[PDB]
Design a protein around this ligand. Structure first.
Ligand SMILES: C[As](C)(=O)[O-]
Ligand SMILES: [Zn+2]
Ligand SMILES: [Zn+2]
Ligand SMILES: [Zn+2]
Length: 151
């Protein structure tokens, strides 16, 4: 790899291998990030309605479709000291939530924790579903499919 590899990939690659026992490639990182981005969009299911019922004109964290299981991953992510590239990866995915309403700035400030939780959740699913320390394209495509069915 060189310094041109998209920013964050480096650090994610390094964290997944050394701390989670998952060997990623550029190809499987892209698949992983597309699945994270998809799941992130799914968290906005019901969010505009919940915001309106609360008298708000913006989406708050309280309005998102986050479950207890994801909340646990988000909390575990916040206690990680090593930088796994989440800030760079967030910019890389160029996330646009599927809503017309304003996303509140305090929620925007939590996007790194949400994405970090989604990354740890995906690592958990990779290990429990693929059977491969170095997942193939098809293994990762399967992870994205089964993740889509819990969001
Ligand atoms: C030098 As590396 C991103 O393969 O840990
Ligand atoms: Zn590369
Ligand atoms: Zn590498
Ligand atoms: Zn395929």
């Amino acid at each position: 790899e060189t310094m041109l590899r998209p920013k964050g990939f480096d650090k994610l690659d390094h964290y997944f291998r050394t701390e989670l026992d998952i060997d990623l490639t550029d190809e499987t990182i892209e698949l992983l990030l597309n699945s994270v981005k998809a799941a992130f969009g799914k968290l906005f299911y019901g969010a505009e309605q919940r915001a309106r019922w609360n008298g708000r004109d913006f989406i708050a964290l309280a309005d998102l479709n986050i479950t207890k299981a994801l909340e646990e991953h988000i909390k575990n992510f916040q206690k990680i000291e090593q930088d796994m590239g989440v800030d760079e990866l967030l910019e890389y995915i160029a996330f646009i939530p599927p809503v017309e309403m304003n996303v509140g700035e305090d929620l925007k400030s939590e996007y790194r924790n949400i994405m970090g939780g989604l990354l740890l959740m995906h690592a958990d699913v990779i290990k429990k579903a693929t059977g491969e320390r170095k997942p193939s394209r098809e293994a990762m495509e399967f992870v994205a499919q089964i993740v889509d069915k819990v969001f």
